[PDB]
Amino acid sequence: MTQQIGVIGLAVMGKNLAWNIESRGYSVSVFNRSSEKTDLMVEESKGKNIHPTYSLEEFVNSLEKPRKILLMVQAGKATDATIDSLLPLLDDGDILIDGGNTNYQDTIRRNKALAQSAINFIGMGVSGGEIGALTGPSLMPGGQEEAYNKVADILDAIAAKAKDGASCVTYIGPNGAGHYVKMVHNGIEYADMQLIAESYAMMKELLGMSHEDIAQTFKDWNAGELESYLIEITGDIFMKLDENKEALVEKILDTAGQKGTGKWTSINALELGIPLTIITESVFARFISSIKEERVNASKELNGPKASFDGDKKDFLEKIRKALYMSKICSYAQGFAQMRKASEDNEWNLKLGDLAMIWREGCIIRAQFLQKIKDAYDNNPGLQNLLLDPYFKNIVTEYQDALRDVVATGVQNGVPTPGFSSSINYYDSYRAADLPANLIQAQRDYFGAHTYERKDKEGVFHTQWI
Amino acid sequence: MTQQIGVIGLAVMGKNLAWNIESRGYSVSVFNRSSEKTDLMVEESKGKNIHPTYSLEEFVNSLEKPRKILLMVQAGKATDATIDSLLPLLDDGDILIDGGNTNYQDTIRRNKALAQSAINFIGMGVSGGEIGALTGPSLMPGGQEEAYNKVADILDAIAAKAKDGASCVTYIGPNGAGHYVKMVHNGIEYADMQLIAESYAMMKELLGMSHEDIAQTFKDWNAGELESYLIEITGDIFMKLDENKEALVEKILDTAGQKGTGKWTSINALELGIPLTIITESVFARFISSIKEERVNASKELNGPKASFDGDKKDFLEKIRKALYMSKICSYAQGFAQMRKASEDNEWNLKLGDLAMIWREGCIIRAQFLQKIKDAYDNNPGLQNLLLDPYFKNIVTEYQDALRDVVATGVQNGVPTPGFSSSINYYDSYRAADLPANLIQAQRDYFGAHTYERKDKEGVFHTQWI
Ligand SMILES: [Ag+]
Ligand SMILES: [Ag+]
Ligand SMILES: [Ag+]
Ligand SMILES: [Ag+]
Ligand SMILES: [Ag+]
Ligand SMILES: [Ag+]
Ligand SMILES: [Ag+]
Ligand SMILES: [Ag+]
Ligand SMILES: [Ag+]
Ligand SMILES: [Ag+]
């Protein structure tokens, strides 16, 4: 009278995972604090091996040992409440797996505390949404390596299967390493969406393209280097019409939301001293678009240039394509530099070549762009920046002319390009052998006596500038 | 045998403050954990009323009550260690004042904990460097208002006197409001230093200007609307010669440092949901300046355009002046929108018109720019963005033409302008009644089923996009 794994939190995500685990031949117990949601699942699981429970004691006593408990409750304090109530009921060696979109610092705090009580805590990032959770998500579990191996086969059976037959799951590293990589991957998707949005803004407000030509443009781009799940979905979106045979994408209110992570990865980059300019401008861009009523009033008070393009539009369309691909490359270069620094500071010993399976960028499809990131770090693990990898190096040095043109016309025509500008600014700052920071060092030496180093002489110096 | 106020932490900042307090006629006790610096201060204070102590017990018993203890020790944990040791020796109503560059979150924690022991805590930001603390610093005290009034006469006597006679000290608000405003003010200074740096970069790299042409340019600008302490000193820095009459600022290693605050103010804006693009890009720009060796090898692998300017150099230099002024306005707009949001979330009831005395920007000189910031919020306290203030609004809408030319010329010439591009992008996005976030909402509605709103009809909607 025992089950092999239990799930707590029977919302859409937790219910779908329990069904996924069940469909592989595993006996699953379930529990929900409010009882109406757990017996609801019972009526939907008439043929499935799902054993409902209605108390925390019954749920824990229903699982074989070492117990494997998958936590799919609300992020934040509800998760801490579930762990705090489970802890006195658990036994030494049990495994708690938090599959929610947790801040990695909370995963580190819980994994450290429960380890003192001989309880394993695996923070697992889950990608795929409700659809993927049912059929096969991609998982980023982090925590005790021995606890992962005890549950590796369950995670392997329920995870997505790539083209190579490989499971979309691997051990990221200790404690909060899994939730961290999940956060950084989502932050990289933040940048890609903002760069695709900027590409659509120029195709619409500058080239005056229809929603038919816009959709066909992205589908063309998805066939080449820009092949990604986001580009493919973007093309289909511009083809879904509404009541009056109009593009529904244009009637959607332009206020972008975010459930954290975007804030989290930019805050982390600032803490690590990593320049995550493109992902941070993307998070800021979502902030600005939420002040919609404030923006509409500002539009009536702040004038700007009228967008005009008299030249060859289809060659400018290709320049936008090169600008999008290069800015995406700088996006990853910043994001993977962030991951390298984070593994150093957290002593995670991460393998960046193994952390290139981003979901929205073509995960199961084995997108060529992802394998190029993996191979770059695989061939040179000590690689300091993806911009210096021979492949990406060759592209950004040839595509920079297109990005500079696209940024220039965008600014001169009043169409904001926070992500495009960040990329060409990053490439120009990163490649600059000399920066005007020497002037900043001089000001800092005067105002706060912070001293300075020199380019010709060794040592540190202070100067009476006045 | 009791003094009126005590100082703990006898480095140069705390020793200068104690001397400042003494020079106004107050009896001062001093103490340092390691006694060696204490009885070095007796050797330097022969004629002044400085009573040294060598135990925390003696230091506490040497002060009249309610005791006024100014903390000037190492930021963070040395401060917490001094507080933890002081607490069992204090009495109800005693006032601890931390004058270090402290994260405002630490002040909120300390003020709440000490209040439960009937101990006042004042987090006080101090600006002006070491010479300022000796002759007259800028003070931003925050904490118990009744405790501020008990030390207000001492703070007013030692603080700098602006050129309208007023002492640059004022009660900012409860708990961490004082250190918070110091953090936001420093963040605004970060942006202005990076924008001045970008201005100098194009004067040299693009306009091929001299080092005395560059110097006289900043002094010319300091005579107009761009008058600030920063610009005036930037002109003096370019006049500092070395032994062989070379410009000394050209020899300083271009690695800009930072002691926090810049990180903190950008992390805070991300937490508040405030688009602080210009200040954050400047913080990231300092990060990029640190990887000097990495930048030097990147310069040998990543090519860019050769900077060249054919047109009127004087006409472009005036555009750089307009680009600098508008970008400065756009950073103040972000910085003061951030302060309004923080007063709301923290319940500080901040009067933004009284929080415009930024040190490096001309607070002691009562710069015309800072008074226009004060007048903007005095004339309209509910003002949501300084871009909407009639004075600033008429300047940004005229100067945008110059900023766009400066940004576009920089991108096409490979001179990185992260702050200039951020400002014009911030202006274009804030004035945009419609942004491409509608596409981001459609993508989110597909991947995570996050639903969306419409522009024409009210309600929430979810679409199957394929
Ligand atoms: Ag995979
Ligand atoms: Ag991932
Ligand atoms: Ag269409
Ligand atoms: Ag993935
Ligand atoms: Ag995958
Ligand atoms: Ag003042
Ligand atoms: Ag200040
Ligand atoms: Ag000179
Ligand atoms: Ag000031
Ligand atoms: Ag002042």
Side-chain angles (χ1 to χ4, degrees), chain A residues 2-129 131-162 165-244 246-258 260-290 292-357 359-363 367 369 371-466, chain B residues 2-242 244 246-258 260-357 359 361-363 366-367 369 371-456 459-466:
Chain A
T2 45
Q3 276 72 237
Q4 300 171 297
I5 181 171
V7 182
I8 297 177
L10 294 178
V12 56
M13 284 301 288
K15 192 168 52 168
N16 286 330
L17 284 171
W19 281 332
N20 195 344
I21 308 157
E22 200 276 344
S23 66
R24 320 298 183 168
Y26 294 99
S27 55
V28 179
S29 319
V30 295
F31 176 85
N32 204 81
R33 185 200 20 100
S34 98
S35 42
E36 47 253 35
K37 302 181 104 186
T38 165
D39 39 36
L40 199 162
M41 184 186 175
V42 177
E43 321 280 31
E44 301 173 339
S45 320
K46 274 283 184 146
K48 295 132 163 83
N49 187 9
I50 294 301
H51 292 249
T53 69
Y54 297 93
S55 89
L56 280 203
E57 289 89 331
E58 181 198 10
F59 172 84
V60 165
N61 290 338
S62 56
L63 303 180
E64 60 173 349
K65 312 207 298 160
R67 311 185 224 263
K68 309 154 195 59
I69 307 174
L70 179 64
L71 282 38
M72 291 301 298
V73 299
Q74 195 173 244
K77 314 184 72 183
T79 298
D80 278 307
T82 313
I83 304 166
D84 283 342
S85 321
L86 283 179
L87 184 54
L89 293 169
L90 301 189
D91 290 339
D92 296 4
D94 287 343
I95 303 174
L96 303 191
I97 310 163
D98 168 32
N101 314 314
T102 315
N103 184 292
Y104 80 103
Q105 296 174 303
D106 285 320
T107 300
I108 293 178
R109 168 181 50 78
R110 294 156 185 163
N111 173 273
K112 178 178 191 303
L114 299 166
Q116 297 173 353
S117 324
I119 300 301
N120 306 288
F121 192 68
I122 291 176
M124 189 177 63
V126 183
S127 295
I131 319 101
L134 190 35
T135 43
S138 100
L139 309 173
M140 302 129 269
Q144 276 96 357
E145 189 189 340
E146 183 154 86
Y148 159 83
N149 289 313
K150 286 185 201 298
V151 309
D153 289 1
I154 294 169
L155 307 181
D156 187 272
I158 66 172
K161 317 285 184 287
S167 271
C168 288
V169 48
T170 204
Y171 175 67
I172 305 309
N175 44 89
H179 275 136
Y180 182 89
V181 162
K182 191 254 190 318
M183 172 190 69
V184 164
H185 284 180
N186 283 143
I188 291 181
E189 298 165 351
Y190 270 62
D192 204 15
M193 292 159 76
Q194 175 60 30
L195 300 161
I196 289 169
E198 289 178 25
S199 298
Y200 142 66
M202 311 223 63
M203 289 183 319
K204 179 190 179 194
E205 287 166 61
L206 197 68
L207 304 186
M209 298 169 61
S210 91
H211 70 82
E212 306 97 284
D213 309 314
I214 279 166
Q216 186 50 44
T217 303
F218 279 121
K219 295 195 231 237
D220 294 348
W221 293 2
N222 192 48
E225 329 157 280
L226 277 168
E227 179 220 345
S228 81
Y229 196 18
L230 250 171
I231 294 272
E232 179 181 85
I233 283 314
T234 310
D236 309 337
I237 281 176
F238 277 95
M239 278 310 183
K240 180 110 194 71
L241 309 106
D242 70 339
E243 189 102 16
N244 315 353
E246 291 176 331
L248 173 62
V249 74
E250 296 286 354
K251 294 303 211 163
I252 298 177
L253 183 61
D254 54 302
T255 65
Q258 48 196 290
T261 305
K263 298 177 170 192
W264 293 345
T265 190
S266 287
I267 285 157
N268 164 264
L270 281 149
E271 291 171 329
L272 300 182
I274 289 301
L276 211 78
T277 72
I278 307 156
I279 290 173
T280 302
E281 289 274 1
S282 300
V283 178
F284 280 147
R286 295 202 190 187
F287 288 172
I288 301 177
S289 77
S290 301
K292 167 80 176 187
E293 202 218 299
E294 189 168 331
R295 285 192 287 114
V296 177
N297 170 235
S299 67
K300 303 170 178 176
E301 308 275 3
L302 303 165
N303 44 303
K306 194 120 212 303
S308 95
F309 190 83
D310 317 324
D312 193 353
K313 304 214 231 243
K314 254 32 172 173
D315 183 67
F316 190 86
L317 192 49
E318 168 66 21
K319 287 195 204 163
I320 298 178
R321 198 199 57 74
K322 304 209 194 88
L324 177 68
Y325 194 59
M326 166 165 181
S327 320
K328 168 174 186 160
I329 285 168
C330 297
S331 272
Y332 280 68
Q334 295 178 340
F336 271 73
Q338 164 184 29
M339 271 200 282
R340 154 74 39 79
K341 174 61 169 171
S343 158
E344 293 168 335
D345 279 5
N346 303 267
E347 298 276 79
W348 282 334
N349 206 10
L350 294 185
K351 319 315 174 175
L352 301 206
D354 298 329
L355 318 176
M357 318 201 303
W359 192 65
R360 279 170 221 210
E361 305 274 357
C363 214
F369 188 89
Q371 184 53 40
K372 275 141 189 298
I373 299 285
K374 160 173 181 55
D375 279 353
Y377 277 103
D378 275 352
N379 293 120
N380 185 13
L383 171 73
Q384 291 216 279
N385 195 306
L386 283 152
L387 291 180
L388 299 176
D389 171 79
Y391 165 72
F392 301 108
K393 191 224 264 183
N394 182 58
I395 286 200
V396 296
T397 60
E398 311 257 71
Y399 282 19
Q400 60 178 304
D401 280 357
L403 181 54
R404 290 175 198 287
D405 289 355
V406 168
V407 168
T409 85
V411 162
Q412 295 280 7
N413 287 268
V415 191
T417 59
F420 279 155
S421 285
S422 267
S423 318
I424 202 63
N425 284 315
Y426 178 59
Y427 179 78
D428 284 337
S429 280
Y430 181 70
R431 85 187 166 89
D434 293 292
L435 285 164
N438 59 309
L439 180 53
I440 298 183
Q441 278 297 105
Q443 296 151 345
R444 293 183 69 244
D445 181 54
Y446 170 85
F447 282 114
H450 281 87
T451 76
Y452 63 88
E453 293 179 60
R454 284 172 69 128
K455 309 184 179 215
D456 47 357
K457 295 162 70 143
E458 271 165 25
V460 308
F461 302 83
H462 175 52
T463 293
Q464 255 47 67
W465 294 96
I466 48 178
Chain B
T2 51
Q3 278 54 257
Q4 293 162 295
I5 179 182
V7 187
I8 293 183
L10 292 189
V12 60
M13 273 295 283
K15 185 212 301 202
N16 281 338
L17 279 177
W19 278 341
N20 196 345
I21 302 165
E22 195 283 327
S23 93
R24 320 297 176 162
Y26 294 98
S27 52
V28 176
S29 316
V30 305
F31 173 84
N32 194 95
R33 181 196 70 93
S34 99
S35 54
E36 290 66 89
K37 252 174 299 214
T38 301
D39 36 27
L40 164 55
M41 192 183 164
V42 57
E43 296 166 356
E44 309 182 19
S45 325
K46 311 313 256 282
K48 324 212 151 292
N49 191 4
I50 295 296
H51 291 248
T53 62
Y54 301 93
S55 94
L56 276 187
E57 282 100 340
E58 178 192 1
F59 174 81
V60 168
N61 286 329
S62 65
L63 301 175
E64 57 167 349
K65 309 196 302 253
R67 299 184 235 268
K68 310 165 166 39
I69 301 177
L70 177 61
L71 269 44
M72 293 297 299
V73 308
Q74 188 172 219
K77 301 68 45 181
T79 296
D80 282 305
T82 315
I83 294 168
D84 292 349
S85 324
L86 268 175
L87 187 53
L89 306 167
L90 303 185
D91 286 323
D92 290 8
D94 287 341
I95 303 175
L96 299 190
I97 316 177
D98 173 31
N101 307 321
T102 302
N103 189 290
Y104 81 102
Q105 278 165 309
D106 284 307
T107 306
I108 293 171
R109 164 177 59 82
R110 288 153 183 172
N111 179 279
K112 185 197 216 181
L114 288 174
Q116 289 158 8
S117 295
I119 299 295
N120 301 277
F121 189 76
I122 294 175
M124 187 178 59
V126 180
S127 299
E130 303 168 351
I131 304 195
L134 173 63
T135 47
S138 186
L139 306 179
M140 303 129 267
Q144 282 100 351
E145 185 191 339
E146 179 166 40
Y148 161 81
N149 289 319
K150 276 193 219 296
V151 283
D153 291 357
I154 297 178
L155 300 186
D156 183 277
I158 62 154
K161 306 284 182 290
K163 72 146 182 197
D164 56 349
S167 208
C168 316
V169 67
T170 192
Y171 175 69
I172 313 295
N175 44 78
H179 280 142
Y180 181 89
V181 160
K182 199 234 184 306
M183 177 195 63
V184 171
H185 282 184
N186 285 159
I188 297 182
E189 294 171 349
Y190 268 57
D192 205 16
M193 290 163 68
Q194 168 65 31
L195 295 163
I196 289 161
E198 285 167 42
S199 268
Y200 146 66
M202 258 175 310
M203 292 190 314
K204 170 183 168 189
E205 296 266 342
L206 199 45
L207 298 188
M209 286 173 56
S210 148
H211 84 78
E212 46 269 83
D213 286 335
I214 277 173
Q216 263 290 330
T217 293
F218 278 123
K219 311 226 213 165
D220 284 355
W221 295 358
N222 197 60
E225 50 200 6
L226 266 165
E227 175 194 74
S228 66
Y229 197 19
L230 251 172
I231 289 279
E232 175 201 315
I233 296 289
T234 310
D236 303 358
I237 288 171
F238 282 97
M239 286 316 218
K240 238 288 169 170
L241 296 204
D242 63 353
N244 303 18
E246 273 192 60
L248 186 58
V249 75
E250 291 303 324
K251 315 233 160 298
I252 304 192
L253 177 61
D254 51 306
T255 57
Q258 55 204 288
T261 318
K263 292 183 175 190
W264 299 338
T265 206
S266 280
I267 286 157
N268 172 256
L270 285 161
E271 276 166 12
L272 287 180
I274 289 302
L276 209 85
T277 66
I278 315 171
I279 288 168
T280 310
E281 286 273 1
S282 321
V283 170
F284 284 149
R286 294 207 192 175
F287 292 168
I288 291 264
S289 66
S290 280
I291 48 165
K292 165 72 173 189
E293 231 56 70
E294 191 172 326
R295 286 190 288 111
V296 170
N297 188 73
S299 60
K300 299 158 182 178
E301 315 269 9
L302 312 174
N303 213 167
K306 173 101 195 310
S308 91
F309 194 75
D310 303 338
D312 187 6
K313 294 189 182 301
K314 175 168 298 188
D315 180 58
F316 197 78
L317 185 51
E318 172 59 28
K319 293 191 187 181
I320 302 178
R321 193 202 63 83
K322 284 173 164 118
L324 179 57
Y325 196 55
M326 160 157 179
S327 294
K328 172 181 183 166
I329 287 166
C330 286
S331 320
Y332 273 74
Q334 291 176 355
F336 271 78
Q338 163 189 30
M339 266 181 13
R340 158 69 39 77
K341 171 64 176 180
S343 156
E344 297 163 329
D345 283 10
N346 293 292
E347 304 273 53
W348 285 335
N349 199 6
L350 299 186
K351 325 293 174 321
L352 300 199
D354 297 335
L355 310 169
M357 303 171 169
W359 181 266
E361 302 278 294
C363 74
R366 280 256 310 178
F369 186 88
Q371 174 81 10
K372 293 255 153 221
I373 303 279
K374 170 174 165 49
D375 286 346
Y377 278 104
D378 285 347
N379 155 250
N380 181 11
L383 174 77
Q384 314 170 98
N385 200 299
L386 282 162
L387 295 176
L388 301 167
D389 172 76
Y391 167 80
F392 294 110
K393 159 207 261 179
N394 275 346
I395 287 202
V396 283
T397 59
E398 185 201 350
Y399 284 19
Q400 57 172 309
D401 291 359
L403 176 53
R404 292 172 196 284
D405 285 345
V406 164
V407 161
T409 312
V411 178
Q412 295 283 5
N413 284 274
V415 175
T417 70
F420 279 148
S421 323
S422 272
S423 325
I424 195 60
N425 285 314
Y426 178 65
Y427 180 79
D428 281 333
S429 317
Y430 182 71
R431 79 179 172 86
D434 293 292
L435 285 169
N438 57 318
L439 175 56
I440 293 178
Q441 279 300 103
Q443 295 158 330
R444 281 172 86 246
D445 182 52
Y446 167 77
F447 285 110
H450 294 281
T451 72
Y452 62 92
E453 300 177 49
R454 281 177 67 128
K455 305 186 184 221
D456 42 355
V460 200
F461 314 92
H462 173 54
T463 311
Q464 300 286 291
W465 292 90
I466 316 166

